[PDB]
Point group: C3
Chain length 287, copies 3
């Protein structure tokens, strides 16, 4: 009796189930062909990459592979406010810092062993956290008051990574080395750029806009006169700049093109069936 009437609603619910099953079939189809696109993009070298910024509230505290060598750290003290207060130059102490000394061999050197110091840099951008590393060095024949410094992604990873020697060589091969001057401060407003490799590894690079400021020799005011170094590391922007393959990093566009492509193939097949019918009518007109 009422089954004949409820057959309409049953057919309607079966119809919506058909809608959604064909949606899921089309979705898995575009998913598979897009996975094929991605796994082919992987196989090729040097793909045109996009750019993408991701505003971050607090960074991951990075490493600062200072290369003092013969020099020594004189003071390390984070400073929330944007102003590092008055100091006492040439006087050690106040090394309120979390450092590690690591030795390794530079791959490009492969014959020179250099000693590296590490520092947990600033991680609170909005708070304007900045680490002030003050150094000192008695006169040497280096002809240049210079010590280098690297910058890798996160210090927590360097703590929680085995084989720190190899990871240090890896972060040395990275394009984020720099040499801050000796004899005056070098405010280093670093910023991060995370590139995703074709293999998938998240290689990181930094992009620092230094601002050197002279060091008044009236402050030391001593007959010691040893080249003493200063840095202020802080984050320029809260926009971590990640880049990846143009298609992979913005999939919702290549999948849009793939839906366009499949729908166009479908539609053009429907139009071709219509054209077959039209040609059949034209042939029947000949008789």
């Amino acid at each position: 009796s009422s089954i004949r009437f409820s057959k309409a609603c049953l057919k309607n619910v079966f119809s919506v189930l058909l809608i959604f099953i064909y949606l899921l079939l089309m979705a898995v189809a575009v998913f598979l062909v897009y996975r094929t696109i991605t796994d082919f993009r992987e196989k090729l070298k040097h793909p045109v990459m996009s750019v993408s910024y991701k505003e971050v509230d607090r960074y991951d505290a990075p490493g600062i592979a200072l290369y003092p060598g013969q020099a020594q750290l004189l003071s390390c003290k984070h400073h929330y406010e944007v102003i590092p207060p008055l100091t006492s130059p040439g006087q050690p102490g106040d090394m309120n810092c979390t450092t590690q000394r690591i030795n390794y061999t530079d791959p490009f050197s492969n014959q020179t062993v250099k000693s590296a110091l590490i520092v947990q840099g600033p991680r609170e951008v909005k708070k304007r956290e900045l680490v002030f590393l003050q150094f000192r060095l008695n006169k040497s024949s280096e002809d240049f008051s210079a010590i280098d410094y690297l910058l890798f992604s996160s210090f927590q990873e360097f703590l929680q990574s085995p084989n720190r020697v190899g990871f240090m060589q890896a972060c040395e091969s990275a394009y984020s080395s720099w040499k801050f001057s000796g004899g005056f401060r070098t405010w280093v407003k670093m910023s991060l750029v995370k590139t995703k490799e074709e293999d998938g590894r998240e290689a990181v690079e930094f992009r620092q806009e230094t601002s050197v400021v002279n060091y008044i020799d009236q402050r030391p005011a001593a007959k010691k006169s040893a080249q003493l170094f200063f840095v202020v590391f802080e984050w320029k922007d809260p926009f971590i700049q990640k880049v990846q393959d143009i298609v992979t990093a913005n999939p919702w566009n290549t999948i849009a093109l793939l839906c366009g492509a499949f729908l166009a193939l479908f539609k053009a097949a429907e139009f071709a069936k219509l054209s077959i019918k039209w040609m059949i009518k034209i042939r029947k007109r000949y008789l």
Copy 2:
């Protein structure tokens, strides 16, 4: 008589009206769902943003919140050509400049009141306009020949904005502060990056590539020997770098995905009706 023949053209014009009304319906549909997408993207925090350059012929003259404090401006003179001509160091005058002195409290300080000077920076990029601000400072205990400087979007806005104290605190919270050295020029080839917030406010940041050049003490050649400061502000590139939410800044792509989505739902519903007919034929084959 002829009405029966003109009925064909009437039906054709009504048909094209149907084409365009269904186009406008589909357009308002994708517009509404895309507005929903945007107003949801607003609700979330830290969305992956795109990047976009917009070549500009003439910039808006920006503010340069110089923080001399105890120091004083010695000369300000724009220079169209790429070369600032020979000067007379240590001699005031020629302050051919449009400055304003503003006092406020730094939010991170909140207990230190600092005095700020403002300068209408260069706005003609192609002409290579560059403002040369020359300073001077008698010896202090600051231990560092340093005065800071900010950079906000436009000086015309700072003129036409009420409550300059609050706007100055806001532009101070921005990530565009810098400290140019004292004792030698600091060519500051600044460039602008306008980020659009999730709320919609157009936050601006600068990205300066300084190039410090030493100041030959043979030029002053006086027993005064006061740390005197120099800057040359100019625009690096004419490409103002604006960034916004990946979807919002490039809508023509997410709307393309939405047209793909609606057309795919339509088509898959048509295919599901075809499958219903096929299943009905299969059931009729059973009898």
Copy 3:
């Protein structure tokens, strides 16, 4: 006999030929309308451009338009390793370099003739190639130990370009000039940004993150005391940053939108035919 049976396969092959011919027709259609979009985008001024990185294994060795003028080059020697070894300051020789001296008139000057030196900069990024140009200059009245330097795309082009004067003026109009200090090294980790103009010309710009490091006067240790200059040019990143019109540089997205548009017009026309049939049924219900 068997022709009646093979007619099915013949119709099927003709059908697939219809599929592909209508695909090619639709493809040429979207190609033509997209070419129209591009040739209109050309006609307009200042289009919002995208950004795109392209990892490069070896750069094209660029020119370094050093402007010493009265000064002189003291040593030029590429160095694969990341370390320039110990030197002998103030002593000429070892100019293991490929330079050219070119004279021209600065367009903004148009009355001052300046002499330019060119250097084949580093081109091997992964090898960390870096050119160290050491200079010297006896005391002058320039009041500033400064000599400028430009950076254009490739030195091979400057060798293989006629009218080097005009090309030098063109690369001078480019936004890639800089002034490295005198009296201490200036490590210049340059990087390249190739912008594609609306006309189509591939304008190049550089983006250098210098890192000045002081020059210990204990190394010269002579009563000569002439301001002598130092630079170390190397590539910051292997990601050449090319930018072009938002649509032109990423066509596969605007063509996706165009396929969406054409398919939507088609579908909405089909739906309008269905609505015509529905209105005809509604009118027949009136009788």
